[PDB]
């Protein structure tokens with residue numbers, strides 16, 4: 797979700813709006829991916 | 838939309854290029870980087886212009 801502080805992403809398929817895996821980046825909010833400290837290509 | 842490469846990695850690439858051309862001459866553009874002292878590469882850079 798682009799440029800949205802995801803404290804309110806599901807307020808406005810339910811599995812892709814829950815808090816199973818939420819990551820906050822500069823581009824927006826990412827749902828469905830796990831953050832990893834390791835670095836790859 | 839934000840840029841894909843933030844300024845830090847751009848600075849990292851520039852520093853990598855600068856260190857490579859300072860230490861290894863121009864041999865890092867062809868294959869493996871080959872070490873050479875700096876005065877003897879400025880000497881060959883003169884020798885390349887007559």
Ligand SMILES: *[C@@H]1O[C@H](CO)[C@@H](O)[C@H](O)[C@H]1NC(C)=O
Pocket residue numbers: 801802803
């Ligand atoms: C996003 O929303 C939260 C509300 O929980 C707020 O505390 C934060 O300052 C907002 N901005 C961010 C995380 O950049």
Ligand SMILES: *[C@@H]1O[C@H](CO)[C@@H](O)[C@H](O)[C@H]1NC(C)=O
Pocket residue numbers: 831832833
């Ligand atoms: C990654 O590093 C941070 C900071 O040390 C740590 O809190 C976290 O447990 C590490 N692992 C993951 C999966 O985030």
